[PDB]
Design a protein around this ligand. Structure first.
Ligand code: SF4
Lengths: 339, 406
DNA sequence: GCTGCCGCCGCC
RNA sequence: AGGCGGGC
């Protein structure tokens, strides 16, 4: 979008009244808005922190006058941020940490196929927020390209200290090590959240990972991201040899070869321990491929700024819209189409 | 009346210090302060709760007897706490330090009570119904199973299931058990944690104590008319070439190296490089043994099978300010940032596991490991020197080893 | 202006 | 590895 397209957008399209009423938590202007930090990011690369707004009219007039490429929502303070010279619990999920498991898109592309990674990430995070934390008032918002932001607005979530935010994050952030060249070796038995998450993700693993993405049909990619999830060197070396002798087996065939070769290798009274351990490695790999991969920094501190809902994405022209169960990135309206 | 007040205030061997008490002033404050400083000293050294308990137990018997029926020891505990409130209320940093040390003191004392005395103190945290336990039974058991195995040594699944059937659960807001939530040691449903009672009591104690210190500070200006100011000020302040590029790889020379240098040479041979601290530790050691500047440049160029030449000459005082940098002693080596994965600098007696050290060393090993456990790395290294043939410099270890053959 | 990253230059 | 300066 041009600078004039952004002027038009803030003049005529941006839902200032609804965003104000959301952040103010009341129909009447309050300190939840007057003392709230906004940061403005400009086309010049300039970044202006500690703005704050007293009414829907003041918020609109200052954003129209400033014409930022985006603005970001911060904490409610004890004093007005704009007088400095004298927060919703948030989660961010991007596609980047799933790039090693998708074939339908490359680099910064997205489609409805790889969007299923973000859809599952939202489903699993929503299950924890609702069932384990008892949160009721949260919304997902498209990041304008290939991710989604959660905003948890429950009074209890807004009042969390940085220690409590870190504990909520450390509960939901199961996949701490994002490296695909190594086995996760997750703690056994699984925590109830992780066991529930596995059962929710299992039905999607065949259709997404083995069939639609099929990332391990490529034998080099299978060596780099499928084999390192296994626990046993003799099994890894046997599979590597078998796939060198039988190239370009599908992800679904390679998934079955793991069980066939393991059954041929592990015989006698110890076989049941190897079968349990192989199942655990396959379960850890279902989680490695499909479990939520949160950006950890934005959640930890009450002071972290995050892009406002309905901002325009400067490279795609997409509006950062709220997400429903039907949402895919191609449904996000572009500013040029809205004009 | 004073005895009856103290009998009522101390029905339990533990107190939240809720009511004000109705040479002793200074001694009792100093004696509590010594215990709190020893707690803070042990916390700053990352000691385990059990090690801290073992160190403080003899100090309690000497300075501040706990668990006595003596009215005077109970008085000493109260009055010392309230006297330290007057000392530490003055700044935010002093309040935070005092609340932390005093809350940890409360934790230790609670753990040293009998289960009967703990229950009486709690009486002076809602349990779930048997129906709510039956509904959640699978999820509660999955969460607690690992804790029953590792904390209660219940290795058999049948014994864990039998214990879990008798075990009661407490339902609380998860915000009160954030430390157990982070470790997945408690089950979570609808914003509640299913349990940790000591952490709840400690947080309530810390919160109440911090509020009372703020109130104490607001009234302190009225006390500035009194004998006490010098003591309060003082107590608040009391808290404040034969050796050449080829020969250095040979057994004849390398048999004289201490373990750090052997570790650095192994990392260099394996990785064909050393990161900054390791390059400096090894470069300066080799200079100290007599490796010339020209031979050192050959050594490094050959080992790394614009960016480096100058730094190696600079170590020899040949560049810039021309400082002939002294080789590092053990104190200096130990002071550097701890080595991480891919680093070979530091001291193996501190940095390696006992398993790795034992394999390298293979009664003598136990003696070396005992020194390591105590943090006496140079003593462990001296023992290895003596057993393989006080040193606190790798170059002295090498020189002494050479002197034994000359 | 500051912040952060990348490259270069020695020093310490 | 740390600090300072310059450029994008
Ligand atoms: S005690 Fe000193 S000489 Fe011995 S291995 Fe450690 S750092 Fe090296």
């Amino acid at each position: 979008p041009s600078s004039s397209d952004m002027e038009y957008y803030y003049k005529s399209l941006y839902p200032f009244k609804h965003i104000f009423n959301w952040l103010n938590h009341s129909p009447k202007p309050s300190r939840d808005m007057i003392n709230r930090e906004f940061a403005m990011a400009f086309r010049s690369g300039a970044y202006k922190r500690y703005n704050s707004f007293n009414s829907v009219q003041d918020f609109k007039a200052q954003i129209e006058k400033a014409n930022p490429d985006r603005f970001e929502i911060g904490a409610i303070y004890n004093k007005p941020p704009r007088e400095r010279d004298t927060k919703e619990l948030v989660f961010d999920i991007d596609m980047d940490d799933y790039d090693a498991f998708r074939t339908c898109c490359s680099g910064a592309q997205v489609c409805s196929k790889c969007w299923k990674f973000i859809s599952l990430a939202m489903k699993i995070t929503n299950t924890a927020l609702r069932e384990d934390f008892g949160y009721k008032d949260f919304i997902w918002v498209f990041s304008g390209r290939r991710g989604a932001h959660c905003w948890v607005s429950d009074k209890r979530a807004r009042a969390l200290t940085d220690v409590q935010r870190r504990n909520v994050l450390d509960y939901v952030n199961v996949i701490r090590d994002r490296n695909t060249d190594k086995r996760l070796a997750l703690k056994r038995p699984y925590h109830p959240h992780l066991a529930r998450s596995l059962e929710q993700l299992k039905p999607f693993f065949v259709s997404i990972m083995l069939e639609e993405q099929n990332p391990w049909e490529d034998d080099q990619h299978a060596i780099q991201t499928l084999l390192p999830a296994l626990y046993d060197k003799q099994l890894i070396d046997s599979l590597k040899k078998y796939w060198l002798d039988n190239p370009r087996r599908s992800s679904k065939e390679k998934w079955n070869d793991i069980d066939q070769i393991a059954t041929s290798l592990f015989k006698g009274p110890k076989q049941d321990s190897h079968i349990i351990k192989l199942r655990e490695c396959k379960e850890d790999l279902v989680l490695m491929t499909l479990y939520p991969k949160l950006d950890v920094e934005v959640t930890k501190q009450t002071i972290h700024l995050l892009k406002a809902p309905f901002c325009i994405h400067p490279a795609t022209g997409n509006v950062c819209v709220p997400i429903d169960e039907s949402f895919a990135p191609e449904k996000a309206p572009k500013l040029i189409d809205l004009q | 009346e004073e005895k009856k007040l103290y009998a009522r205030l101390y029905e339990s061997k533990l107190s939240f210090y809720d009511l004000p008490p109705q040479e002793q002033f200074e001694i009792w404050a100093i004696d509590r302060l010594k215990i709190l400083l020893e707690i803070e000293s042990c916390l700053s050294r990352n000691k385990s709760i059990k090690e801290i308990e073992t160190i403080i137990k003899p100090q309690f018997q000497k300075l501040l007897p706990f668990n006595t029926e003596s009215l005077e020891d109970r008085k000493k505990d109260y009055y010392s706490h309230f006297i330290l409130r007057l000392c530490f209320c003055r700044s935010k940093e002093l309040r935070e330090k005092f609340v932390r040390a005093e809350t940890f003191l409360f934790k230790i004392r609670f753990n040293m009570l009998t289960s009967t005395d703990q229950t009486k103190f709690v009486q002076s945290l809602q349990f779930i119904s048997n129906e709510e336990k039956a509904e959640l039974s699978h999820q509660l058991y999955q969460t607690v199973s690992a804790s029953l195995q590792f904390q209660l040594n219940l290795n058999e699944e049948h014994q864990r299931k039998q214990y879990f059937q008798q075990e009661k659960f407490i339902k609380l807001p998860f915000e009160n058990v954030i430390e157990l939530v982070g470790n997945r040691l408690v089950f979570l449903k609808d914003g509640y944690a299913y349990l940790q009672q000591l952490n709840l009591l400690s947080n309530e104690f810390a919160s109440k104590l911090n509020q009372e210190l703020i109130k104490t500070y607001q009234y302190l200006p009225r006390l500035n008319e009194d004998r006490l100011l010098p003591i309060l000020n003082h107590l608040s302040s009391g808290y404040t070439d034969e050796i050449n590029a080829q020969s250095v790889w040979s057994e004849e020379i390398s048999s004289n190296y201490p373990l750090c240098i052997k570790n650095l040479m192994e990392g260099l041979k394996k990785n064909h490089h050393l990161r900054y601290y390791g390059r400096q530790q090894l470069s300066l050691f080799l200079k100290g043994i007599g490796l010339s500047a020209d031979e050192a440049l050959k050594f490094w160029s050959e080992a790394f099978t614009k960016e480096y030449r100058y730094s190696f000459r600079h170590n020899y005082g040949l560049e810039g300010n021309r400082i002939n940098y002294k080789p590092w002693d053990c104190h200096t080596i130990l002071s550097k940032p701890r080595p991480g994965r891919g680093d070979y600098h530091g001291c193996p007696f501190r940095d390696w596991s006992h398993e790795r050290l034992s394999a390298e060393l293979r009664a003598q090993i136990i003696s070396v490991l005992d020194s390591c456990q105590k943090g006496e790395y140079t003593i462990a290294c001296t023992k290895v020197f003596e057993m393989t043939h006080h040193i606190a410099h790798p170059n002295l270890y090498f020189e002494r080893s050479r002197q034994l053959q000359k």
